[PDB]
Each structure stands twice: as C-alpha cells, then as structure tokens.
C-alpha cells in the first residue's frame, strides 16, 4: 500500500532562558524512527526504532549536523516573525514545521507537504502543485516572497519528489519486518449496566498496526440508542494502538447491536456482538 516519510519540527522560544527549545521527530508511516532534541551540550540525532541502528556513524553525524543547523534557522525565524507581528521579546512563541512525502503502491511519489505554523495557526504552505504558496496574512506574504526569490519551491520539489522518496524506500527496506507487518486488532465486547433499565456496550480493538481503523456500532433498525462515544485512537506504548466505541442501549436490546471492525490487518471485516 501507500507509505509516508514525515518530519515534525517544533521550536519554542524561552524569554530570558537562552536559545529556543527545538525538537524534531521523524516517522515512517505510524512508526517514529528518529528524534533530535537540542536540550543538551552536544545534541545528537538518535534512533527511536531499533532497526535504525543498522545505520552507520556517517548517517547520524549528517542528520545531527542538519538538525543543529535547522534549530539555528528556526531561532532566526522566531526572531523574524516576532518583528513581523511587532511582538515583544517577553512572550513565548511557537514555530512548527511539518514536511515529507507519500509513496503510492508503485513506490513513486504521490504527494508532498511543506507547511509552517506560527503559534498554532497555519502560516505558510506549499500547495499541491509544488509551485505556489498559501500565505495566511501580510506577514506570511513577505515569507512567500522570500521563498519565491530563492526558488524554494523548486528546491522543495527536488527533495519531496526525489530525496524523500529515495530514503523512504531505504527505511522501508531496513525495517521491513516490522514496518510492512500488519497487526490485526484483537477485538471483544464488554457489558456494563448503568441502571436497571440501561447498559453500556463497549467494543474494543487492541494492539493493531497501523493506527487507521474503523469501529462502528450497527443496529438492526429496532435499536433505540441512548448515547454513543468513540475515543481517539491511542498508542498502547509498544508500537501498536487501541480504540473503543461504546453505545448506551436499553437493557434487553443488546442483541440488536453489532460492532463492525475494519482494519488492513484483518483478511475480512470482523463483526462482534455481546455474548455473557
């Protein structure tokens, strides 16, 4: 199927406490594989997936140099943005950057993203044409003009379409045993009576990978649902994910409800009901 290489960079200024904090994380699909944190005397890019230890010192030295340089650029960018918005040096501000590429089933470039956010809001985005920009205000229009002056969109295309695609293929090969292994969800239904007249049916999906999943409570048209709840997909902590969906139904109608679970790791969708 499709695969993605994505980097997430955060820089947060610290008034009167030195240089901004800078944290970079890299993901292949839903698996984090690298991290850089500048809160160290000699900060290093480090592996966060064991299969990345197949990479030699040349790789880590190069990524460490890139991440250290990127942190400096973001410190400059925070100073520039503060001036664009006439903001004082006493406030903490956040600059975020997400970038990467998506491969199609053919292994070819499918889509790329390059997006900046300032204080939690879109700031400057490279459009899907990989040649025009979206600036959100007059400040971002200055940044857009500077990127156009420097032909940044063409340098982005070269990375997103070639460098990014080439290295995503390499990472997928180095970690194929885990990255390409689909782990289906383990599913069950639990029953929790609320009162004498109503009960909660909770449909569980545990230990699946990747994170994309659909949990749906279906009913036969004769069910009278009192309430529903679907929690955000959450990490189990071991590389897999969890999710559940609940419905509050009148006691005695439990058998009118069926939980439907769809996940790439299942050969076919699973249907569960509450059986004491």
């Amino acid at each position: 199927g499709s695969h993605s290489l994505k980097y997430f960079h955060t820089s947060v200024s610290r008034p009167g406490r030195g240089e901004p904090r800078f944290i970079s994380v890299g993901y292949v699909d839903d698996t984090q594989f690298v991290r850089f944190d500048n809160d160290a005397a000699s900060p290093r890019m480090v592996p966060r997936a064991p299969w990345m230890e197949q990479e030699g010192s040349e790789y880590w030295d190069r990524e460490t140099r890139s991440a250290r340089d990127t942190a400096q650029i973001f410190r400059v960018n925070l100073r520039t943005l503060r001036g664009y918005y006439n903001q004082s040096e006493a406030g903490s501000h956040t600059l975020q950057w997400m970038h990467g590429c998506e491969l199609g089933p053919d292994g070819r470039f499918l889509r790329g993203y390059e997006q900046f956010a300032y204080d939690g809001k879109d700031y400057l985005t490279l459009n899907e044409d990989l040649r025009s920009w979206t600036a959100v205000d007059t400040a971002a229009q200055i940044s857009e003009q500077k990127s156009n002056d420097a032909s940044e969109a063409e340098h982005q295309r070269a990375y997103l379409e070639d460098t990014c695609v080439e290295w995503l293929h390499k990472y997928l090969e180095k970690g194929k045993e885990t990255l390409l292994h689909l782990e289906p969800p383990k599913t069950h239904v639990t029953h929790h009576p609320i009162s004498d007249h109503e009960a909660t049916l909770r449909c569980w999906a545990l230990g699946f990978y990747p994170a994309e999943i659909t949990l749906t409570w279906q009913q036969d048209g004769e069910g009278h649902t009192q309430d529903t709840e679907l929690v955000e997909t959450r990490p189990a902590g071991d590389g897999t994910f969890q999710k559940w969906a609940a419905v509050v139904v009148p006691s005695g109608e439990e058998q009118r409800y069926t939980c439907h679970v769809q996940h790439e790791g299942l050969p076919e969708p699973v249907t569960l009901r509450w059986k004491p």
């Binding site: 890299g26 190069r62 890139s66 900046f116």
Partner: peptide
Amino acid sequence: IMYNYPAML
C-alpha cells in the same frame, strides 16, 4: 533524511 536549509521566513 532531513531536508537541508529551509529558506528563511
């Protein structure tokens, strides 16, 4: 790998 030198804002 990371991209080198995002153009300054």
